[PDB]
Design a protein around this ligand. Sequence first.
Ligand SMILES: [Cl-]
Ligand SMILES: [Cl-]
Ligand SMILES: [Cl-]
Ligand SMILES: [Cl-]
Ligand SMILES: [Cl-]
Ligand SMILES: [Cl-]
Ligand SMILES: [Cl-]
Ligand SMILES: [Cl-]
Ligand SMILES: [Cl-]
Ligand SMILES: [Cl-]
Ligand SMILES: [Cl-]
Ligand SMILES: [Cl-]
Ligand SMILES: [Cl-]
Ligand SMILES: [Cl-]
Ligand SMILES: [Cl-]
Ligand SMILES: [Cl-]
Ligand SMILES: [Cl-]
Ligand SMILES: [Cl-]
Ligand SMILES: [Cl-]
Ligand SMILES: [Cl-]
Ligand SMILES: [Cl-]
Ligand SMILES: [Cl-]
Ligand SMILES: [Cl-]
Ligand SMILES: [Cl-]
Ligand SMILES: [Cl-]
Ligand SMILES: [Cl-]
Ligand SMILES: [Cl-]
Ligand SMILES: [Cl-]
Ligand SMILES: [Cl-]
Ligand SMILES: [Cl-]
Ligand SMILES: [Cl-]
Ligand SMILES: [Cl-]
Ligand SMILES: [Cl-]
Ligand SMILES: [Cl-]
Ligand SMILES: [Cl-]
Ligand SMILES: [Cl-]
Ligand SMILES: [Cl-]
Ligand SMILES: [Cl-]
Ligand SMILES: [Cl-]
Ligand SMILES: [Cl-]
Ligand SMILES: [Cl-]
Ligand SMILES: [Cl-]
Ligand SMILES: [Cl-]
Ligand SMILES: [Cl-]
Ligand SMILES: [Cl-]
Ligand SMILES: [Cl-]
Ligand SMILES: [Cl-]
Ligand SMILES: [Cl-]
Ligand SMILES: [Cl-]
Ligand SMILES: [Cl-]
Ligand SMILES: [Cl-]
Ligand SMILES: [Cl-]
Ligand SMILES: [Cl-]
Ligand SMILES: [Cl-]
Ligand SMILES: [Cl-]
Ligand SMILES: [Cl-]
Ligand SMILES: [Cl-]
Ligand SMILES: [Cl-]
Ligand SMILES: [Cl-]
Ligand SMILES: [Cl-]
Lengths: 213, 213, 213, 213, 213, 213
Amino acid sequence: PIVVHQAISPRTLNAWVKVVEEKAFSPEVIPMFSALSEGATPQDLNTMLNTVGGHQAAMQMLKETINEEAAEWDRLHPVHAGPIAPGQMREPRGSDIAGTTSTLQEQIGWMTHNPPAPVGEIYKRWIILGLNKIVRMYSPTSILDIRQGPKEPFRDYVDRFYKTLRAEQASQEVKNWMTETLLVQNANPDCKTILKALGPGATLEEMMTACQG
Amino acid sequence: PIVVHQAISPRTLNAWVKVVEEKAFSPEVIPMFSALSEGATPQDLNTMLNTVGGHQAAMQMLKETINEEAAEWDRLHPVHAGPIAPGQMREPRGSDIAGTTSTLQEQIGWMTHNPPAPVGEIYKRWIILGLNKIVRMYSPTSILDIRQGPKEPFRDYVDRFYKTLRAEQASQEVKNWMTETLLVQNANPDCKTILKALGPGATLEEMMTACQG
Amino acid sequence: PIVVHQAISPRTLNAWVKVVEEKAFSPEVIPMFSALSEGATPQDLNTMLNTVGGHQAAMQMLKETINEEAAEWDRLHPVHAGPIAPGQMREPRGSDIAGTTSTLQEQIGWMTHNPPAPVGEIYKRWIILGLNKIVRMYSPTSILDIRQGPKEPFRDYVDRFYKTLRAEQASQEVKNWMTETLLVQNANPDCKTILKALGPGATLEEMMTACQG
Amino acid sequence: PIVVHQAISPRTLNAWVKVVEEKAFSPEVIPMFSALSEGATPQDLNTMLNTVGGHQAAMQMLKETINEEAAEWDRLHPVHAGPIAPGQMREPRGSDIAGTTSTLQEQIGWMTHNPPAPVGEIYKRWIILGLNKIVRMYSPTSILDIRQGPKEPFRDYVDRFYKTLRAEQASQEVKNWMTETLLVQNANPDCKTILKALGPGATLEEMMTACQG
Amino acid sequence: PIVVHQAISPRTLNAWVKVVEEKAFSPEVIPMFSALSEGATPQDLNTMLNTVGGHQAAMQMLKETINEEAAEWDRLHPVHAGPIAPGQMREPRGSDIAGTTSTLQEQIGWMTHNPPAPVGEIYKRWIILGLNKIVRMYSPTSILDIRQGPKEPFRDYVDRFYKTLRAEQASQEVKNWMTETLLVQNANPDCKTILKALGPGATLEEMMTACQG
Amino acid sequence: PIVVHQAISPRTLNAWVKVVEEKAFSPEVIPMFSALSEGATPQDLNTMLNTVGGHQAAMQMLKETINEEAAEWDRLHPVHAGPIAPGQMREPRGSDIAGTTSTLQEQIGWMTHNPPAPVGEIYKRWIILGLNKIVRMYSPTSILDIRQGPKEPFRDYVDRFYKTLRAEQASQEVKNWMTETLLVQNANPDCKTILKALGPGATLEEMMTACQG
Ligand SMILES: [Cl-]
Ligand SMILES: [Cl-]
Ligand SMILES: [Cl-]
Ligand SMILES: [Cl-]
Ligand SMILES: [Cl-]
Ligand SMILES: [Cl-]
Ligand SMILES: [Cl-]
Ligand SMILES: [Cl-]
Ligand SMILES: [Cl-]
Ligand SMILES: [Cl-]
Ligand SMILES: [Cl-]
Ligand SMILES: [Cl-]
Ligand SMILES: [Cl-]
Ligand SMILES: [Cl-]
Ligand SMILES: [Cl-]
Ligand SMILES: [Cl-]
Ligand SMILES: [Cl-]
Ligand SMILES: [Cl-]
Ligand SMILES: [Cl-]
Ligand SMILES: [Cl-]
Ligand SMILES: [Cl-]
Ligand SMILES: [Cl-]
Ligand SMILES: [Cl-]
Ligand SMILES: [Cl-]
Ligand SMILES: [Cl-]
Ligand SMILES: [Cl-]
Ligand SMILES: [Cl-]
Ligand SMILES: [Cl-]
Ligand SMILES: [Cl-]
Ligand SMILES: [Cl-]
Ligand SMILES: [Cl-]
Ligand SMILES: [Cl-]
Ligand SMILES: [Cl-]
Ligand SMILES: [Cl-]
Ligand SMILES: [Cl-]
Ligand SMILES: [Cl-]
Ligand SMILES: [Cl-]
Ligand SMILES: [Cl-]
Ligand SMILES: [Cl-]
Ligand SMILES: [Cl-]
Ligand SMILES: [Cl-]
Ligand SMILES: [Cl-]
Ligand SMILES: [Cl-]
Ligand SMILES: [Cl-]
Ligand SMILES: [Cl-]
Ligand SMILES: [Cl-]
Ligand SMILES: [Cl-]
Ligand SMILES: [Cl-]
Ligand SMILES: [Cl-]
Ligand SMILES: [Cl-]
Ligand SMILES: [Cl-]
Ligand SMILES: [Cl-]
Ligand SMILES: [Cl-]
Ligand SMILES: [Cl-]
Ligand SMILES: [Cl-]
Ligand SMILES: [Cl-]
Ligand SMILES: [Cl-]
Ligand SMILES: [Cl-]
Ligand SMILES: [Cl-]
Ligand SMILES: [Cl-]
């Protein structure tokens, strides 16, 4: 990464390889990726993806998402013809952003320019977009199927509800509706009766402390 | 964090993920969070919360607490209309403090200004307030129910008393009353008689050495 | 490595030795090598290869590849006769690039010159070329033999397909043809019928979500 | 700590938490605490104590010792009334030294002043005084009860003697008397006879090599 | 080591102690030693050898090799008599190079002089010469005894061949002859017939892919 | 340590505690101590000794050795009476060198003076002298009792010989005599006959390769 260029640390590499081995494509793996790739060059970003053995269906899907985003970049940013002047960088293509047709020094060149061409952060967006698709697709449950069991503690139901919700393929407005409609609706008879008496203004804390006893 | 901006270390991330896995929401997890997040940007703070898989009922409660605090900030700090002058930062909203509508550079901008706008430390307050609510709520025992067993060493009773007390949802004045009233009252017959003979001026050390034999 | 010369870190050495022990010559070992050897001198590169015990057939093959590349370098770069002027470096031979006939200071000398003679990155190319040969040769499967089982989830078939494809000894144009022709052709009867109905324009995501149920 | 302020390292935190878990309040835990808290601010010192789960009887005793020392500081250092001048620090109270009524910047302010107000080292004294009380109180043995067994190697007896002595609640003059009187007196008949023949001028080395055979 | 003098890192020490415990005097232990001792002073080099418990026959042999080399140095470098001038270092003896009659500051003095007296790299040569003797002597097999089994995969035979070859006590010209003569000669009947048909121009890759089926 | 003063690292502390737990007072523990305490202040040196739990007979012996050396220092260095001038350090006593009557800043003061008063290296000498006494005393074998078994490989005998020799309480001239006289004398009949035929000029390598078959 760039803090001056610096090689990606052995501990960073190992941490990323381990989380993929241990947790596959659970939602929390994405902010971990983002955190381990802070200030990453495209080279560093490719290093992290390429160090993954297994899961090659997902890694292939990720490539295709990356290529779509790169093609969309090219459409919006047509490269102008001409010789590059002294002390200037060429305009980066989608493939340059993704690290395949640009060198490390060119990536250092773009990232440290005034004003910067933040190719690391652009490529990182595309990767996370692709990781989101994989997380959503590899989710085993739908939010409509999360229903509290007759002897299930409310805390356990809410844990499963919001785990599934975090994986759901929907915006925040839709997520608000899922919380507003389904959470109380799919609680068990006794807790569902208690929560309806609180009303639709109740906080999660209130709902949880209400169905505690 | 900021010491110059620095990426959050793999060891810091792993340490935080591990403590949540191992200890859930035991009281000691909060000073650990605070220690691992020293000089954290809002981005760093969101990274730590977002890297948690599981416990999504608590993580959702935390979001709601964060949103309440953000709304209260907005009420007390109405944003003034106008173009931002050269070499000045805009006034941060609650959502900017919580890292959702502000960039990393804006957070660096506020935190390193003269005088500083300490958005990292403000957001950290809100998070710890929310973690406190969770710790208190997830506590399995009340301080009124802590009673020394007939063959229980006094040290073991006092260990359970102050563990439960640390989790209790009360101020220091109330905690002083709990110590002043309940500790001796709920000791076993033989130790309770011994402690009443010491009187209400006795230190914990004195009380413990008295009920040793 | 050079960031100023720096000794190769114990953690870097151990990380490289471990990955060879654990994963042998799986495709992902190569980007790991590359990542652990960022800014490496030829001395550092020889250190990493020489620290491997076992697999000496592969390590010998690697030497021969290195020697071929070194001989090809010498052919293209005939050394000119004459005394080296003050504040100048001699032209490096293939053996100098590979670290056997050059000193550490000479490698520092070439790598930090204006303009640089990037002997570390040249030798690293030759090593990775040789590692590729080994990976390809040590692959146990051919892409033609990857066929979906009658009760095999499509995701598992695609995982095996692209794992084998990554090891295949072919260019990207050939790889595109392998994806275009074989993937659908060697799916099981029920999924193969479904994928033909999508057509040859379908993304991997689409193909995978189609054969999910 | 301060080396410039620096956040307490994850490895330091973990090392302290582990030693308390593993060794409880064995005498060697105190120099470990001191070593792990070198140049610590009061904030850092509270972080270390607060990260301890369990042992809350001891942690409460420690608080009370801290409060006694803070009250004694206040008595000896009455705060003078007046506005604090430009480029000056206020006089710290006991609660400021203990980190509860002072900010981190105020602690940095006192510790880096010319001349310094070493609030970190003052609070560290109070903590170690309190840890000593706990170690002494939690010791299971008295030095008077350490007696060499009839078939016990002298080295093993001396190991138990000085382990118990290190925990004893006594000054060095008293410790010298314990060594001068009890060590030889409570040896077994055969070794006790041998040691009396050496006389009271003998070194520990001499005493140990004498009772070897 | 010197990068300014720096103490040898705990991780470096532990890494060296572990490799000796785990791998004894396998050939790969030598480049590991060299890598862990980059820029080492003679003091650092003695630290590494002295931290080895066990294997004292080998460590004694190493001392004798070191003493031979030191005596040879003294013969070639007779020390000239006279007072050492201001801002000059004395000429180092063999014992000074080996760290026994020189101080740390004297070693820093020689290593950082203009031009340098590279006593660290000289002593490191002598140690590696001695380690080579030990590796060769402690090798359990001769290259003449490596013969392919009738059902042994060619890769396994070649692995054993070059493992034994790496330990052999011979120059590269002799090693070339061992490869040219023995490798094919001591293959099993079926593979030996196949390899003779390739001819003496064949690469190892070619020989291995030929005897694959 | 001092590299500027620096706190002793958690990894250094743990490494020292572990080696004492694992290896007790084996000869190799002493160079490990020395290596882990490079540039240590007396405070750092006391930290390392004080962090040891158990072995308090040895730790007490060490104190007594330290006190002897401190008393001898005082005898040779009588402190001169007078007020200390501006920008000067007082003459250190034995107790100041051992860290008990001097502060950390005073130790920094002496160690960084021009010319330096190397109190860290002086105290380190005294400690290692005391550790040597303990190693020698705690050795279970005498060099006179090391005799090759009738079916014992010569390498194993030589390993035991030099392990015991390293622990022996004797100078290098005496050690040379032990090697010259006992090693061959206490070999088994068949190897003893072979070694006498080599003569007293033979190297260890020669002796070992001679008794190999
Ligand atoms: Cl994986
Ligand atoms: Cl998965
Ligand atoms: Cl790759
Ligand atoms: Cl360009
Ligand atoms: Cl640009
Ligand atoms: Cl960027
Ligand atoms: Cl479900
Ligand atoms: Cl779930
Ligand atoms: Cl579920
Ligand atoms: Cl409803
Ligand atoms: Cl968790
Ligand atoms: Cl919980
Ligand atoms: Cl997230
Ligand atoms: Cl702004
Ligand atoms: Cl502002
Ligand atoms: Cl802040
Ligand atoms: Cl209870
Ligand atoms: Cl409890
Ligand atoms: Cl309880
Ligand atoms: Cl009462
Ligand atoms: Cl291996
Ligand atoms: Cl393999
Ligand atoms: Cl080698
Ligand atoms: Cl040159
Ligand atoms: Cl050049
Ligand atoms: Cl290079
Ligand atoms: Cl197959
Ligand atoms: Cl496969
Ligand atoms: Cl397969
Ligand atoms: Cl088809
Ligand atoms: Cl604990
Ligand atoms: Cl305890
Ligand atoms: Cl706390
Ligand atoms: Cl103030
Ligand atoms: Cl002040
Ligand atoms: Cl301080
Ligand atoms: Cl006892
Ligand atoms: Cl004991
Ligand atoms: Cl005992
Ligand atoms: Cl007596
Ligand atoms: Cl060993
Ligand atoms: Cl061996
Ligand atoms: Cl030694
Ligand atoms: Cl000199
Ligand atoms: Cl010189
Ligand atoms: Cl050198
Ligand atoms: Cl063999
Ligand atoms: Cl072999
Ligand atoms: Cl073999
Ligand atoms: Cl032949
Ligand atoms: Cl121990
Ligand atoms: Cl022992
Ligand atoms: Cl102590
Ligand atoms: Cl002074
Ligand atoms: Cl002085
Ligand atoms: Cl010193
Ligand atoms: Cl013996
Ligand atoms: Cl032995
Ligand atoms: Cl023995
Ligand atoms: Cl003899």
